[PDB]
Holliday junction resolvase (Thermus thermophilus phage 15-6), 251 residues
Amino acid sequence: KGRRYENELVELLKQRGFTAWRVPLSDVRVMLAGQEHRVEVKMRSTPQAASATRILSKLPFSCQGYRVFFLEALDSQCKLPKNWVRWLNGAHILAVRLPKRFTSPYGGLTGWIIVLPDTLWDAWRSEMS
Amino acid sequence: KGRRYENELVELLKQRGFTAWRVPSDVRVMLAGQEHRVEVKMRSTPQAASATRILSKLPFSCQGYRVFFLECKLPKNWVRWLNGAHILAVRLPKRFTSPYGGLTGWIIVLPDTLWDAWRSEM
């Protein structure tokens, strides 16, 4: 009931070596370079419902100061999807979950798309492997 | 190395039924389902913590905060110690706080808005 995907994202981040946890308030927290960051979690049933249809083939890319990528992707990298700016709602990281059947042909094995500020990309990469 | 008292406060809060932790304002506490930074200060004497005249007054409300032992204006050192956070935890040796009712040595400085959510978590 919504917490399901927040817990899934927390376990996926903890598997990749991140210190992550859940805060009901409906938010997720992550440690990047020794700093706590709020992660907004959105789940949509289809790429159209998440305004990601034209996005999927472009990942990873940088747009309006954000790096947008599939959760497991480490490959080298415009307006941004209007629904996404509203979804950030104060937080700086956004995690969008789609069914894996939609993301997987494009390389998104887990179904998650991470919208992260460009300032945080260096720290995010140095918290894996 | 300063982390000893943050861990002590986290265990004391978890004992009283709070969801508290130290991040790898290093302490976080969950009040009514909301995450709050807790600033931790440890001082060797009541004078070093600007608490000499405070100890006999606890518990009280001053400048919009409820000041009490863990279990009128506020000291100027304390406003600077909050430094952006909204909750402040001051630790003194128990020998100083105990004759006044502070068995643990901790003084909590909590906003009046959070007093209702703090009470209903014990």
Notes: The domain at 3-121 of chain B is CATH 3.40.1350.10 (Trna Endonuclease; Chain: A, domain 1). The first strand of chain B starts at residue 19 and ends at 22. Helices of chain B lie at 3-15, 76-82, 94-97, 115-119.
